[PDB]
Design an enzyme around this catalytic site. Structure first.
Site, PDB file in Angstrom:
ATOM      1  N   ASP A  49       0.855  -1.185   0.000  1.00 18.25           N
ATOM      2  CA  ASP A  49       0.000   0.000   0.000  1.00 18.25           C
ATOM      3  C   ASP A  49       0.891   1.234   0.000  1.00 18.25           C
ATOM      4  O   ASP A  49       1.448   1.601   1.039  1.00 18.25           O
ATOM      5  CB  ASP A  49      -0.933   0.004   1.210  1.00 18.25           C
ATOM      6  CG  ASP A  49      -1.825   1.230   1.253  1.00 18.25           C
ATOM      7  OD1 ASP A  49      -1.764   2.049   0.313  1.00 18.25           O
ATOM      8  OD2 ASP A  49      -2.584   1.378   2.234  1.00 18.25           O
ATOM      9  N   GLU A 128      29.470  10.367 -12.621  1.00 16.52           N
ATOM     10  CA  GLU A 128      30.623  10.801 -11.831  1.00 16.52           C
ATOM     11  C   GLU A 128      30.155  11.664 -10.665  1.00 16.52           C
ATOM     12  O   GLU A 128      30.433  12.866 -10.611  1.00 16.52           O
ATOM     13  CB  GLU A 128      31.610  11.558 -12.716  1.00 16.52           C
ATOM     14  CG  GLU A 128      32.974  11.772 -12.092  1.00 16.52           C
ATOM     15  CD  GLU A 128      34.026  12.139 -13.119  1.00 16.52           C
ATOM     16  OE1 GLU A 128      34.409  11.259 -13.918  1.00 16.52           O
ATOM     17  OE2 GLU A 128      34.470  13.305 -13.128  1.00 16.52           O
ATOM     18  N   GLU A 130      29.703  13.202  -6.721  1.00 15.83           N
ATOM     19  CA  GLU A 130      30.668  13.900  -5.885  1.00 15.83           C
ATOM     20  C   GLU A 130      29.959  14.370  -4.623  1.00 15.83           C
ATOM     21  O   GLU A 130      28.744  14.583  -4.628  1.00 15.83           O
ATOM     22  CB  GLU A 130      31.285  15.070  -6.655  1.00 15.83           C
ATOM     23  CG  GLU A 130      32.315  15.868  -5.899  1.00 15.83           C
ATOM     24  CD  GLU A 130      33.140  16.737  -6.825  1.00 15.83           C
ATOM     25  OE1 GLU A 130      32.596  17.187  -7.855  1.00 15.83           O
ATOM     26  OE2 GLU A 130      34.329  16.970  -6.530  1.00 15.83           O
ATOM     27  N   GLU A 176      40.136  15.846  -2.292  1.00 20.61           N
ATOM     28  CA  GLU A 176      40.468  17.263  -2.137  1.00 20.61           C
ATOM     29  C   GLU A 176      41.216  17.805  -3.351  1.00 20.61           C
ATOM     30  O   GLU A 176      42.176  18.566  -3.217  1.00 20.61           O
ATOM     31  CB  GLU A 176      41.283  17.501  -0.864  1.00 20.61           C
ATOM     32  CG  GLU A 176      40.530  17.188   0.414  1.00 20.61           C
ATOM     33  CD  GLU A 176      41.178  17.808   1.635  1.00 20.61           C
ATOM     34  OE1 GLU A 176      42.423  17.896   1.668  1.00 20.61           O
ATOM     35  OE2 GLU A 176      40.443  18.207   2.562  1.00 20.61           O
ATOM     36  N   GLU A 184      35.649  12.190  -4.440  1.00 23.40           N
ATOM     37  CA  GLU A 184      35.004  11.524  -5.562  1.00 23.40           C
ATOM     38  C   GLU A 184      35.497  10.089  -5.638  1.00 23.40           C
ATOM     39  O   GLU A 184      36.687   9.825  -5.457  1.00 23.40           O
ATOM     40  CB  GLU A 184      35.285  12.259  -6.882  1.00 23.40           C
ATOM     41  CG  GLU A 184      34.503  11.730  -8.078  1.00 23.40           C
ATOM     42  CD  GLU A 184      35.119  10.492  -8.704  1.00 23.40           C
ATOM     43  OE1 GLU A 184      36.216  10.079  -8.274  1.00 23.40           O
ATOM     44  OE2 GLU A 184      34.501   9.928  -9.631  1.00 23.40           O
ATOM     45  N   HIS A 233      29.055  14.643 -13.706  1.00 22.75           N
ATOM     46  CA  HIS A 233      29.204  14.438 -15.138  1.00 22.75           C
ATOM     47  C   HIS A 233      28.642  13.077 -15.525  1.00 22.75           C
ATOM     48  O   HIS A 233      28.597  12.147 -14.718  1.00 22.75           O
ATOM     49  CB  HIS A 233      30.672  14.538 -15.544  1.00 22.75           C
ATOM     50  CG  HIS A 233      31.352  15.772 -15.041  1.00 22.75           C
ATOM     51  ND1 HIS A 233      30.663  16.921 -14.723  1.00 22.75           N
ATOM     52  CD2 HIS A 233      32.658  16.040 -14.810  1.00 22.75           C
ATOM     53  CE1 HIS A 233      31.516  17.844 -14.312  1.00 22.75           C
ATOM     54  NE2 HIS A 233      32.732  17.334 -14.355  1.00 22.75           N
ATOM     55  N   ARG A 303      36.452  24.724 -21.557  1.00 21.41           N
ATOM     56  CA  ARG A 303      35.972  24.268 -20.259  1.00 21.41           C
ATOM     57  C   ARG A 303      34.567  24.767 -19.948  1.00 21.41           C
ATOM     58  O   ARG A 303      33.862  24.132 -19.158  1.00 21.41           O
ATOM     59  CB  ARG A 303      36.939  24.718 -19.164  1.00 21.41           C
ATOM     60  CG  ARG A 303      38.279  24.000 -19.204  1.00 21.41           C
ATOM     61  CD  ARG A 303      39.247  24.556 -18.175  1.00 21.41           C
ATOM     62  NE  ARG A 303      39.727  25.883 -18.546  1.00 21.41           N
ATOM     63  CZ  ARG A 303      40.949  26.342 -18.306  1.00 21.41           C
ATOM     64  NH1 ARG A 303      41.856  25.610 -17.679  1.00 21.41           N
ATOM     65  NH2 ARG A 303      41.269  27.569 -18.706  1.00 21.41           N
ATOM     66  N   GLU A 321      30.249  13.439 -22.915  1.00 18.66           N
ATOM     67  CA  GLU A 321      30.225  13.825 -21.511  1.00 18.66           C
ATOM     68  C   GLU A 321      29.322  15.040 -21.340  1.00 18.66           C
ATOM     69  O   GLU A 321      29.589  16.100 -21.912  1.00 18.66           O
ATOM     70  CB  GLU A 321      31.636  14.133 -21.009  1.00 18.66           C
ATOM     71  CG  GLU A 321      31.713  14.453 -19.527  1.00 18.66           C
ATOM     72  CD  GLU A 321      33.136  14.672 -19.052  1.00 18.66           C
ATOM     73  OE1 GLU A 321      33.996  13.813 -19.331  1.00 18.66           O
ATOM     74  OE2 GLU A 321      33.395  15.706 -18.401  1.00 18.66           O
ATOM     75  N   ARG A 323      27.911  17.801 -18.665  1.00 22.74           N
ATOM     76  CA  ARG A 323      28.466  18.388 -17.454  1.00 22.74           C
ATOM     77  C   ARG A 323      27.418  18.987 -16.527  1.00 22.74           C
ATOM     78  O   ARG A 323      27.658  19.068 -15.318  1.00 22.74           O
ATOM     79  CB  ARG A 323      29.470  19.485 -17.822  1.00 22.74           C
ATOM     80  CG  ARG A 323      30.547  19.055 -18.805  1.00 22.74           C
ATOM     81  CD  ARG A 323      31.743  18.449 -18.100  1.00 22.74           C
ATOM     82  NE  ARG A 323      32.640  19.479 -17.593  1.00 22.74           N
ATOM     83  CZ  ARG A 323      33.895  19.266 -17.220  1.00 22.74           C
ATOM     84  NH1 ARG A 323      34.440  18.061 -17.279  1.00 22.74           N
ATOM     85  NH2 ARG A 323      34.623  20.287 -16.778  1.00 22.74           N
TER      86      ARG A 323
END
Lengths: 415, 415, 415, 412
Positions: A49, A128, A130, A176, A184, A233, A303, A321, A323
């Site tokens: 339920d 990917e 993080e 870091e 990550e 990503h 970038r 990819e 982003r």
């Protein structure tokens, strides 16, 4: 069925069935192991339920059955007694089809549509994610005021070990790289549904391991104002009988199929934010002055572009990819939306234009409302589900927009 | 490969890949040991993104590969689980050559240039860094004010033991020879790149042991105003088919090749400070009334000269000692700059003149900007790298110059 | 999606053990290191093998064959010191990637497929009841100088046998002990499908032999080891199921349907040839003599004990079955079951009426040779294999017939 | 160097240098570990005197140096104390060149000659040596008479474990008739594979002795049973491409056909190196698995050369059936390779697929030595010495008195 052998081998006591809701939280129920010994368990499921869940409030949710997926059975490392973890789907008792408002069912339907279209055979996707680690965090909201306040190899190795035992293939552990407290963990790519399940398990494992050491861990897109944000990503590609359909000759060795994919994603980018960035906090990210992609374009070096083509020596490994997505997005829905947007571009051979060289949640929801056309294509999505989702997110948007904030007191109290 | 043997022997779990940035700090990443078994690891490397690093802001840096150097594999003593340490270089996947802004690549290119010139076959170098040990240290800087405050065989034996396990060859261990809290550890000389790597490992080991014992250790050139500073003398020589090319006859049994070496270093000394003394704190040391050298001259007896010729039992061990460098200098870059200056001196046969008997960071950077000519010979250095380094070091100088200091309040607050 | 992968992973198995049965009925085995089995291509390509040295397979083909494992049969060995994984294998001709002409398991699978194609039914249920003898010691010898055989003659051992069967994975039902004569035993096991039950018979024999040897006694399955006592047999219960309905169940003599009656009639008509496969030993016909529990006349009855086919009383129509009495444990399970099934199917197809409710190996082989017609029907059996089998058995027949026996010395030494 | 690292890790006490003589037996010498740490060890070797060994009875063998090969360093499992094992070559002090009578040097020179010829780049060789396990054996011979007499998972697993510790990649363990065993090992290049064969023999002997049984590799220990052979699979590779793979009979290329033709033509001489024992010719008789006819086929059992079926063109190979475990691996492999290369170079057509004694073999080898000296890998001096060495065993066996003759002719 793998569950039978697992239970017989390790004298399991309890069975934990899990399923994700619309908002992206793993609800779970527990049972004694006796019932699982019957194949009728996998042939019929168990009554359920779900009317109390946020996205499923209605008449239909008052009666549902859970169907376990034996392919995902595993043993739980954390419990003090042997416990068997399983994932489940929701099936309508009236018609024996997957419930309309199930993200996993939506993802499976998307895969089926891709298979039927004949463009390709399978799709490979690798996210990917993080996250951030802190020592302590406090927050509070009330009519009288509000607050929020924030306060190595050991834990990193612990997380890697936990993931390995739960059954994931770790590859790298970035620590870091950009700013303090950001981590990550890479994992090998896989098919769509399996990868979504892997993401869910990764989040669960990270939460538990971080808690066990007295720390805290968060996946918020941007938890600190003047610091780097957290993104996710997505690398994606399509395979047809062992052939990398995206691999080819042209810009960065891409094929016209890949270019049309990119063009479709570019065209439907605005609508996609409703799924790949379904949070007010998300748009604190996506601002100039940081790593976030500000320009909606595709490039191999720039970038600032939101779409990238990582270098791969082998043509077998050509991938696209994206982003802009964020961890807050629901895995199933985000992946399905991206796949549909790409297929829409392919079906119309939309040229993406020249490769680049040298917003708000309300706006995204408004864009999605009009752009819903392509999502419903093939019957994978339905207007009922889309409307329910839009209303559900609009509620939170209104709640956030109507509140008052301490910065307002700072700026205007004296005036 | 030695790594395969080590992993097979000690069932290593994790692989730690390490490299150095432009500032001279060691960055590292970790991987599961599985992927390192196949030779494809050493044949292809691993994807990496160095755009976040300070000196690698170039667009092309978004996709670098890391190439491990199997000759440096070792086991980590500190880690609870077995861990295999390796050093790595940075390669550009577009071209398959070492990245332009990699100090290790620059050092290797300098060695190759020397070999091609054929003045010698190899070069041997030994540094002599010092450091300080304290019980506690505090410091803080803010718009409201600034602060800094300061507060045996066991630890020395522990440091020596740790170095031996890590694989170095200790020779001597001084202790408070001239001032309280100062120490130095001699180590066998070696070739350029290997010695630089050894220096990095030495710093790492000293830091870890001092932390483990509850103390603190610093390599700052001059942490205390009234006491001596931490220098890094550098001994070096060139070898050609077993012949000490510097060994000769005349003043201190030194050859004309060595004399031209000294002359070139003397001529280019003012430019070398940009690499051998890359910090503002460095020039606090270089002042009269202290051990530090003052005059740009060479003498076998005058302790105030910046270059000296130690006495040696045999001509086989004849070497040149440079005094002015400091621990803050980046090993690879400092050694490369010294080697190129000496080679230019030899090429132009510059007479150093008579043997002696009886500045600031801004000035050094300005001088280097004009003296860059010799560094670019043979393509060892590049103007883009030089300009990036100059800007990076200039930013710190500006920051230090513009800030106020408590001594200013002491002197002028009442006026 | 394989049991073997999970078993190896969860029990760090070192060794794999492949087993297959030859024409005569003896299980050959071969061992492998475990590492090779982890590849998925292992189950896709098998392993090369040379069987030209085996009795019945002497030929040109037998030099290039591949063992194809069947993942459904994976189990763990109880008796071995180190963890060992047992698998059963089929034999494939590399020329066509199809089953070998002379593989009993291939013949059984082909028989099942032919039944499925005929449309008469869907599955076959078979339950055998092999008896066996336990002794304390046995000796025998034969040579030009003379011949000899001598025999020297409980909850614990029976419990051990049942425990071993349970560990190996069978489902025991009952344990009869010395019902008729001293030393005879029986273990009942739940019925199953044709091929799986055939495999289970081999596992039962293996387990019984191992346990008897471990406890220091000896055990045999031969049809008649003693002259004065009863023999050993394999009563075979058979049934056919279609869409979950027992087709045999019906209204008629003992509640049998026309299909069952035709089945019985076919078995009755072809009983003479079946003896070649169901009683392949000369010792078998020592059992088939009047004055004991063995059948004599070829007929079917519900009460009479002399009939070779019986209709046991059952509680429900679901369990209606046919019992054949003449087979004996020396038979090869695959060939015996296949021959019975084909005889029954021929009876059904030709609608042979059984009538009304109530030898030697040489003759049996001749009858089979001249009546092979009903076996090749549908391609399950082939004349090449039949001829090879007849030649294989004739050698033993002649060898026994032309020897000199001790009883002849009693009868005729002084004549 | 691998040995430095191994010694440092496992605080080894003793080093053990091993080499092989002409007859195939492995000699060894021990040494304290102190001197192995020096790098001059691997540059200068150790002085040695081999003048007392069978095949090296010459003035030259007075002074030889053992050059260790670092690539082969391993640790001993059987020794009580940590011991390092290294293989060695033999160098003449006069010229710093390999000794003419060193089988390992001959094999290495054969590889170099192949590389120079330009036909290919590497050779892949896989042998399959069988063996027998017995409980006890006795034998004696003297002026008064002669006699000889002969009398599971655990042991097989023990052998496999020992081989794995040595570092061999085991693949399968065939068992059976009446005591016959085979262990498959992954193929490799020529010299490495020869070293692996030697180590396999050593480990099998030691493991069997540990459990107390006995093991033999002799080609035919029993009159009525099967023999023990060494099937040899061979292939040649060039730039990562299997040169044998192609279109033709059983998917073979012209190069493979020429290889087969050369082996067929020179097969009679090869028996000198591949079957160097009188007992080995008891196996080569009709009525058993042994092949008698010198022809090539894909199906027939009696053919001496076979083309096994394989899944992919990469694995295409040629199998020779006649070789024998008694053979010296280095010499056998080198002889096969030279026969094949001569066939390829002279373009000898094998023909169409089908569908003696040690005395004669040695005479034929002496007659047809020509193809072995081509390229200068074999030398007439070594061939003469080898023939001279084997003739003594041949004569000694031929001129003895055997018990069967007493049965046949005592009362005649």
């Amino acid at each position: 069925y793998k569950s039978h052998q697992l239970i017989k081998d390790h004298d399991v006591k309890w069975v934990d069935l899990r399923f994700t809701d619309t908002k992206g939280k793993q609800q779970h129920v527990t049972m004694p192991a006796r019932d699982a010994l019957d194949d009728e368990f996998f042939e019929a499921g168990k009554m359920f339920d779900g009317s109390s869940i946020a996205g499923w409030k209605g008449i239909e949710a008052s009666d549902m059955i859970l169907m376990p997926d034996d392919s995902t059975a595993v043993l739980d490392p954390f419990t003090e007694e042997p416990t068997l973890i399983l994932v489940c789907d929701i099936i309508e008792p009236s018609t024996m089809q997957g419930y309309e408002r199930d993200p996993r069912n939506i993802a499976k339907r998307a895969e089926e549509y891709l298979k039927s279209t004949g463009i390709g055979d399978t799709v490979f996707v690798g996210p990917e994610p993080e996250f951030f680690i802190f020592d302590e965090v406090k927050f509070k909201s009330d009519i009288s005021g509000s607050m929020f306040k924030i306060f190595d190899h050991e834990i990193r190795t612990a997380m890697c070990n936990a993931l390995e035992e739960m059954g994931l293939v770790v590859e790298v552990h970035h620590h870091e790289v950009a700013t303090a407290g950001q981590n990550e963990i890479g994992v090998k790519f896989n098919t769509l549904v399996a990868k979504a399940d892997e993401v869910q398990t990764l989040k669960y494992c990270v939460h538990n391991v971080a808690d066990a050491y007295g720390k805290t861990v968060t996946f918020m897109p941007k938890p600190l104002y003047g610091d780097n944000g957290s993104g996710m990503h997505v690398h994606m590609s399509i395979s047809k009988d062992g052939k990398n359909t995206f691999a080819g000759e042209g810009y960065a060795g891409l094929s016209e199929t890949a270019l049309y994919f990119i063009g479709g994603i570019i065209k439907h980018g605005k609508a996609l934010n409703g799924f790949t960035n379904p949070s007010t906090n998300s748009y604190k990210r996506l601002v100039p002055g940081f790593e976030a992609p500000v320009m909606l374009a595709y490039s191999a070096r720039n970038r600032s572009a939101s779409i990238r083509i990582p270098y791969v020596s082998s043509p077998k490994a050509r991938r696209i990819e994206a982003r802009f997505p964020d961890p807050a997005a629901n895995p199933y829905l985000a992946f399905a939306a991206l796949l549909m947007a790409g297929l829409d571009g392919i079906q119309n051979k939309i040229h993406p234009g020249d490769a680049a060289d040298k917003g708000s949640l309300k706006e995204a929801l408004e864009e999605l409302d009009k752009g819903r056309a392509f999502l419903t294509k093939g019957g994978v999505f339905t207007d009922e589900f889309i409307d329910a989702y839009i209303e559900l997110k609009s509620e939170e948007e209104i709640k956030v927009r109507t509140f008052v904030h301490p910065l307002e007191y700072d700026l205007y109290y004296s005036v």
